[PDB]
Amino acid sequence: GMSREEVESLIQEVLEVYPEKARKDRNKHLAVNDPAVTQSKKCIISNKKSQPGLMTIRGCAYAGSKGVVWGPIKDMIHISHGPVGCGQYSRAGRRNYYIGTTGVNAFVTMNFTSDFQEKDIVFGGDKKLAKLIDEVETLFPLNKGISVQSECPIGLIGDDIESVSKVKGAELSKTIVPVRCEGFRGVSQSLGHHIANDAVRDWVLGKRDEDTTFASTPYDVAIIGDYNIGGDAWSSRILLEEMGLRCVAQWSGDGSISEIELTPKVKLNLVHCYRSMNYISRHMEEKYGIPWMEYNFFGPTKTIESLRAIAAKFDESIQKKCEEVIAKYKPEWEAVVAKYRPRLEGKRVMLYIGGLRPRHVIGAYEDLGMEVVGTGYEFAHNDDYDRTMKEMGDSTLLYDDVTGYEFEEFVKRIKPDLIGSGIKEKFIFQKMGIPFREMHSWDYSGPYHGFDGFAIFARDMDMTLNNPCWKKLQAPWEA
Amino acid sequence: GMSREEVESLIQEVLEVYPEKARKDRNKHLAVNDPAVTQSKKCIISNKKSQPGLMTIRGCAYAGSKGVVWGPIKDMIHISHGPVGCGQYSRAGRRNYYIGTTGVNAFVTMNFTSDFQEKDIVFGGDKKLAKLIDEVETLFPLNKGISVQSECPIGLIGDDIESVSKVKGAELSKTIVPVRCEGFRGVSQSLGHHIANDAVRDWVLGKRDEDTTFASTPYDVAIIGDYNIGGDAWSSRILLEEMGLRCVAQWSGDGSISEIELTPKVKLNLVHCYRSMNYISRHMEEKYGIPWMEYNFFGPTKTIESLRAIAAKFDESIQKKCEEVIAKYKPEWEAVVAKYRPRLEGKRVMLYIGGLRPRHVIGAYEDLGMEVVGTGYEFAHNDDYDRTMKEMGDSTLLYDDVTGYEFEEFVKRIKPDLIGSGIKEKFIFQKMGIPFREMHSWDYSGPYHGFDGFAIFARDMDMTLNNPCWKKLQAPWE
Amino acid sequence: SQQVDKIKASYPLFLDQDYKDMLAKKRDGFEEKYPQDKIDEVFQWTTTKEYQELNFQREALTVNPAKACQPLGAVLCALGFEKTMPYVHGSQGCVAHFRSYFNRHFREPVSCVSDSMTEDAAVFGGQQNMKDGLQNCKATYKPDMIAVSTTCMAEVIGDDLNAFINNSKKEGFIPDEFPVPFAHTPSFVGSHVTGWDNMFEGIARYFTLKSMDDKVVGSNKKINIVPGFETYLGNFRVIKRMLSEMGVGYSLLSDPEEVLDTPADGQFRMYAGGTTQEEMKDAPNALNTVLLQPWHLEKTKKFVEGTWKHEVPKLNIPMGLDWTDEFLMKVSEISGQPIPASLTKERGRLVDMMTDSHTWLHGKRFALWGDPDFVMGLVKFLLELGCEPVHILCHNGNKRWKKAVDAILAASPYGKNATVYIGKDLWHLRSLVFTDKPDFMIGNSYGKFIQRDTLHKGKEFEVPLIRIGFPIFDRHHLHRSTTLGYEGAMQILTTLVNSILERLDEETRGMQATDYNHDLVR
Amino acid sequence: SQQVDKIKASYPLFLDQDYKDMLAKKRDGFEEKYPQDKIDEVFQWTTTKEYQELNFQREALTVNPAKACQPLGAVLCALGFEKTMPYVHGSQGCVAHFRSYFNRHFREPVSCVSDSMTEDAAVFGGQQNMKDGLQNCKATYKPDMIAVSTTCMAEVIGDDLNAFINNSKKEGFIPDEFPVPFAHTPSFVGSHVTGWDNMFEGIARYFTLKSMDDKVVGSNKKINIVPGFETYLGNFRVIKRMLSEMGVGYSLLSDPEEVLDTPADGQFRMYAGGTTQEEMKDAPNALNTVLLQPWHLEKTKKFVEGTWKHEVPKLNIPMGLDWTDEFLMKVSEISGQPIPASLTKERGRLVDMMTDSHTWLHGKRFALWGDPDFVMGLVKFLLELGCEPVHILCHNGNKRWKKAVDAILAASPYGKNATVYIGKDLWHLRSLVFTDKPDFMIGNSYGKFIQRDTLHKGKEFEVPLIRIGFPIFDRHHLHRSTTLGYEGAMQILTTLVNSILERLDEETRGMQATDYNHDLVR
Ligand code: ICS
Ligand code: ICS
Ligand SMILES: [Ca+2]
Ligand SMILES: [Ca+2]
Fold it and tell me: Is A35 helix (H, G, I), strand (E, B) or coil?
């Protein structure tokens, strides 16, 4: 690889293209790792505004709320409140899997909107939203609640979605959740998470506070922050219930409103995506006394560690079902390693993803003998960067809110074997002859969580990295 | 239309292109109808050899045997004995519909062949044919008979398929039918029908002569010569059974070997296609005393005529049920005429088909107010032309073994609204902007037989003749 | 569990008994799900006439739209110019979405930038974002031109694009002659097609508005072609191919075809091909200007006619037989070039295909949706083929357009059971295909969930989707296809007749049940 | 019965209860049918290894061949010559069949004559048929040339075509210099492809054999291209286009593309386009001769090498990436022309599609069949895509070919579970797709009955057919497609990846059962 001095010169060189204001900012968001450093704030800043005109990969607060947290909740209807675009571009873009009868009792893949026109902008959309709610009620009678996911203009025109919500909520005896996730708020998808978690807290989570009819057990848990991309949350749950636990809720992939309302009854919150759901987790501890812990179901090494950390919170019966689960899956993952590690050993991976995966997947790569030479996040905060620096090797590259230009130039120099990032990056790198895997949507593959996902992840990394197509980019008459 | 003098001049003009020898022959095969003429041999000759190099539409004796008569018989395996072509070109070409489990108990769409190579031509294929029989027996155990359909070289190399068939027939206790339908025999598909009817007679038909165990009734009939294109025989049968008859066999669309074996037990043979099956019908009358009659299930008029003629052969109970059948379908076909006749009224059709249809379909065209201005056959004999000349109007054109060049020149002048013929003609007339309906394969539609068929026929003639595509052939800048 | 030599993804992994049992536990235990008889009852109801009438009485709620928003169009329009960066003044989340949208359709890179206006700028304006943004983007990606559009935030707070760009030049953020054409493109007005028109009109204005003095109509001997919002590569290529085939001098104004189809040869090419600045500046000297998609190029037409003084011909989109004929005769008339034998032959070949295939097409019933020009072209061609368009839906359609379509349907016996719907969505369409079932749908990928709904009612109710339009996300490389001209007509006919023949084969594939009609020859 | 406003054809008319009842009557009463349980048991058995072993032990019986006979091939070859009438010396039934065959695949006219030999001539020879035949055909259809082949009857009885044709000239039946090339084409030797090769060599001989004295290799600066038996119009067209794109002088020797695609404009054109006589005469003066389908152009190769003295290059069929690369590099080398930017980009575009589509292709298992060159090209391209060609069948393949293909499979990790079968038929193939089930079959229409068989065993056992080859009778206009070059590679890739995606959609279309994996985006 590269010396510290070389990477540090790579940074300086890439940044010489920018005007000084953008240069001085960018400098702060690109770091060369030191895995001793436990205080991320020493080396790199995060969660600041994007520089204008630099082709950030970031999304918006609406994407964070509607696209990420609320969207997946299958038996509510979720309204895209604003013009036609945002709901349309997100419609079915994210493989938050669920079981249901879509259009009848479940509604995830559908796009409900208010389709704001100029009359709504000039005169407000509160009466439109109120008539929209009655229309939803007549035509989708089996919905179990509604949310109202605000797009940019709502707050800008002075609409009062909170009042509509409580008035119609009372009239219909229904939970209607106003979410102020307008895209100008904050700097990325991140504030949307926060906003969305605060809306769950205020309008939903409290509903069974006085209800003592749920029959709970010592082994009740919630999977918090797993949105079941290709079935990941499923492939996680099966391991927890094989271990003897009772998974009462999933937030929010294959998730229902009743399961969210029952979450305050659990004994432990198992949080996967800390970035998105550390808000509500802290609330549930303050209010209900429910402890929470971070875990990692990416590759055998991390899964085994998590399974054992989780069991140790319980009694010996759970701790030995744990060892039985681990013994059961041992031959399966060992075979996946034996098959694929020889095909991937020594190969170098660069990542760029959103708020978790850029760290969480590192063990899985290492379990196939691969090296993550570079990683970064669109919208992490410094508590994510604290957790990353330990998981990366010395002199590796760290980038926050990377520009298109930067990422391209970093690849040209580092020359990784495999890039994992998103849809707006994939076609770029493919043309440079670098294998690319989509590490949000899993290229339409997965699950990657658990022991069953590992086998798919390993198959996928190999199918792409060693594909015959990559040898064919030079015309033989230009060799 | 044209005066007799015009059509007769049309004939002359088209023939001037030929060398004298082809000209003198062709002259005898092209006529201007005179519908009083009961003896077709006065106006036109038929069933002679093709002139070389004139692009006949004709097929071969193999096609008349294997493609036409035996092929359809569903629970026997039929062997294309010779090189690989013939069985490959007629594999699944002909829509002889059947019910079965193909590859298991029925075999119609499959191609079984001896695939002759050079060693087989030089030293004969008799030992190959005997080894092929045993392999058919191992791999297709539920087959109920085998036929061996001779391709051209079999007779030419002096192979003895008759002896193989008796020997292997005896070893395995199975009916094995040698058929000498090699393509150089005769002049067309016709000799193959004959040859095949003679192979049925000799190897299959007599098998239950001394079996008295079949429970017969006064109302037992067989449908002779309906090969069930698109379901035509099914759409005929339903009507005969509704009329109270018991249809024991179909020859040979959706046909089984046991139904052929039971046919000598019936009271009357209902012959649709006279050309192909008059041979065996004549035999069954000589040998078994079973009478036979011709009929026509094309269009309401002919079908009503046929149901009533058929009925009158039986008692008052069948004749009564007849009038109830007729009564029941009256509103259905009347609605078809109401809907389609106004769309097709006065339209002129030219036909060229094989050995029946060129006459049998005329009443159904007339039931939609259409005029058949011209017709002819690839392989008719003069007994077919006898039966045609009444069904056609004065001064209409008649052609036998039409050449490509002829038929094209005849259309250029007559300018029909609609031409109905086969696959080797369709694409020619479409490029001329003349609507074209395939009148063998029904253009992948049908059935056309009976009252259910008529509705489809009518829908089809209209769908094509009035299609929007026909007004687009000339670029607007020309 | 996984067998390492036969590894299962989500399908079919989650069908394993152990995941079935766990999913059953989850449902019963915690989901409080409506009974399945009740889900069955409500399903049957969404398929009825009763439900359809309630469905069509919606005034406030849109479900499953069939349009996007204006700036999507402006981006596409901007990508067709040489070395041009699409630049959308407003919120960054829009641009993430635009990019990914086109990424999934074209499976290519789509370059576009935002100036990342936040809550700060929602109050004091985004003037600073535009100065720094313009400066940043020019420096980093080195376009020769930046083509500016707007998100609904910038619209709502009233940012003055003209003043913001002029001040960016006066304070020195970008050079005075660096081309920054713009267009306000509010997402709450019209649709994506309207943004394309607005952007194009902005760029034509930038390059010609103040230089009209030296212009003379017809002095360059070319015909300008404006393609409009176009997302099939073959459409741009067919139009260029036909015009060069006739020897006709032309300028295709907004030509994205290269940048949406760069080769994978070791290099990323951020910019490729595209209409040049000089072509836009010289455009007023054309003989005339032809609009391929006139129903969403109205603003552009007014400018072309009012300022360039071109007599824009009244042509439909060149789709199907009659309209491609009309296009070519009009190009011939304007240019003085005859229609060459090669295009006469191609026409005849198309006719020949119609003749071979009419018996399977005849009377087949379609539901279909899309953008207004595309939809009317498809309706026109279906009529030429003897097919019955039954349910014709244009969500971004207008009353004048609907009138024009209704007159097209009235000129044909095949239009008699056709209704045109404007303002309605795919939840409306889903009702129509239950209540008045067609043979197929012709539409974009969203349509897959309608087909899914119909199959649930019963196999006999299923209405299969034939994918033609935008976006197509669930099949690969269909964006390379052609819908325009004799060429695209040939491609449509082929897909239509073979969709019918595939579905017939499916219906007759049942051994000893339906395989009596399973013909080798069709 | 029929309802006049919703008329039913055979499907679904015969599913009505009264036809069902009647069909049940006919069976019970008269068909003496085997019991259904016994049909089921025998069916299950045909699906097994035990049956396969018996199936592969056949020496005498052929079931469902995947080849036709020589004169089919000779006719196609002859059609590619200017105003030429294909004429088959022998029985008329052969020609009816040849025409109908090609008519269904091309949906065009196919003109060809017989001299209608009968039983008379089976004994005294067909010398009179040839004299009258040649005379009649020349006078009636006015060819400029008559290209003669033979049916198995003429071969068995030993007609000397050479002496019959010379005696035709001597006695004045046709003029001395009227061109009448011939070839003996025995149907009991090789296959349709061998017939093409014999005809072509015969025409090449006719026009050059006795005029070699004045020839100088490379004096015309062209490269001859011999296409072989080819039934996709796009293959002829692509080769011509690429060569013209490189500025390469060429002669396509046997060029049926025009006569197989005439316009429907009011006129029937018996003859259109085609290689001219002067082209064949001048062929020896080419720089070289390239054989696009060398595995069935062996006789032609011997003649071109031995008499024209061309150093025929050792190229595979230009199919897929590597072999189109090789073709282009060889043409560039022989011609001195560089490969142009436009072809390098097209290549890069193909690579890009491969990169976008690799994840759905990877590891997909194919069974496939066809003519030797087509099959090896397809095998080669599958390997490039990362697919596994498991069952490779060529009924007219030879031992040398099978070795060559085996070497291709061993050069790739994706060849490891592949076996190549020569001399076997579609009944052999049907056993293979039961016992060692692939994901799809790639083949011609006959394959549709295999899929029908597999679906009968169970939905999980169904192997869908992807139609590529000859004949294709049950879909329209596929014969306009391209399988050669980067173009054809792009069309094959797109069909593969979308057939996979269509089948996945089918599998995941089940509401609340499998529709969790019914993704809008793939
Ligand atoms: S939520 Fe987040 S971007 Fe924790 S907004 Fe994003 S389905 Fe990413 S790195 Mo797309 S914080 Fe989930 C995420 Fe990570 S959408 Fe998915 S992949 S783990
Ligand atoms: S048998 Fe005959 S040619 Fe009577 S050889 Fe031919 S299925 Fe024709 S006019 Mo194709 S005597 Fe049948 C016939 Fe008529 S094949 Fe069919 S249509 S009624
Ligand atoms: Ca791409
Ligand atoms: Ca045609």
Answer: coil
In whole angstroms, give the CA distance from residue C272 to residue C281: 20
Local structure of B15: helix, strand or coil: helix
C2 touches chain A (CB under 8 A): yes
Residue with tokens 């939609």: B368
Report how far residue B51's alpha carbon sits from residue D115's, in angstroms, rounded to the nearest whole number.
7
Tokens of A463: 């199918």
Q: Does C508 touch chain B (CB under 8 A)?
A: no
> Strands, DSSP E only, in A227-287?
246-252, 268-271
Q: Could you tell me which chains touch chain A, where touching means 3 or more CB pairs under 8 A?
A: C, D
Evaluated on CA atoms B382, B386, B391, B395, the torsion sign reads positive
* C-beta atoms of D325 and A473 within 8 A: no
Query: Which residues of B touch chain C, with CB atoms under 8 Å apart?
Result: 91-93, 95, 97-102, 109, 231, 427, 430-431, 441, 443-445, 460, 463-464, 467-470, 472-473, 475-478
Distance CA A254, CA A73 (A): 7
User: Between the CA of residue A372 and those of A32, A346, A380, A436, D38, what are the distances in Å?
Assistant: 13, 10, 18, 14, 62
Q: Which of A95, A180, A185, A193 is catalytic?
A: A193
- Which residues of C are less than 8 Å from D352 in CB distance? 261-264
- CATH number of the domain where residue B175 is located: 3.40.50.1980
Q: Do the beta carbons of residue B359 and residue B391 sit within 8 Å?
A: yes
| A356 CA from centroid of ligand 1 (Å) | 7
Same domain, D88 and D166: yes
As for how many domains chain B has, the answer is 3
Q: What are the Cα distances from residue B282, in Å, to A42, B197, B268, C87, D308?
A: 109, 11, 12, 90, 65
Closest partner residue to D30 (CB to CB) among B19, B136, B249 is B249
In a domain, A85, yes or no: yes
Cβ atoms within 10 Å, residue C495: 17
DSSP state at residue B353? B
C137 is catalytic: no
Q: What is the whole-number distance in angstroms between the Cα of residue A355 and the centre of ligand 1?
A: 6
Asked whether residue C462 is domain-assigned, the answer is yes
Residue type, D49: K
How far, CA to CA in Å, does D447 sit from each of A297, B74, B450, D469, D491? Answer: 46, 20, 34, 11, 20
β-strand pairing of D440-443 with D465-467:
parallel
Chain D residues 269-328 with CB within 8 Å of chain A? 321, 325, 328
Q: How far apart are CA D23 and CA D14, in angstroms?
A: 9
Residues C355 and C493 in one domain: yes
Helix or strand or coil: residue A470? Answer: helix
Alpha carbon of residue B395 to chain centroid = 27
Adjacent-strand bridge partners of D343? none
Nearest CA to ligand 2 atom 11: B355
Q: What's the CA-to-centroid distance between B297 and ligand 2, angstroms?
A: 15
Element of type H or E holding B93:
none
**Residue among A187, A476, A243 nearest A355 (CA):** A187
Which pair of structure tokens corresponds to residue B273?
């296609």
Nearest to D93 among B19, B63, B132 (CB): B63
Give the strand pairing for B146-150 and D84-89: unpaired
Show the tokens assigned to B164.
């193989």
CB D112 within 8 A of CB D88: yes
Catalytic residue at C112?
A: no
CATH of the domain at D410: 3.40.50.1980
Domain ranges, residue C347: 320-363+484-522
D188, HSE (Cβ side, Cα atoms, 13 Å): 25
Residue pair A352/A358 in contact (Cβ under 8 Å)? The answer is yes
- Domain check: are D96 and D203 in the same one? yes
Which residues of chain D are within 8 Å of residue B57 when distances are taken between CB atoms? 96
- Nearest CA, atom 11, ligand 1: A355
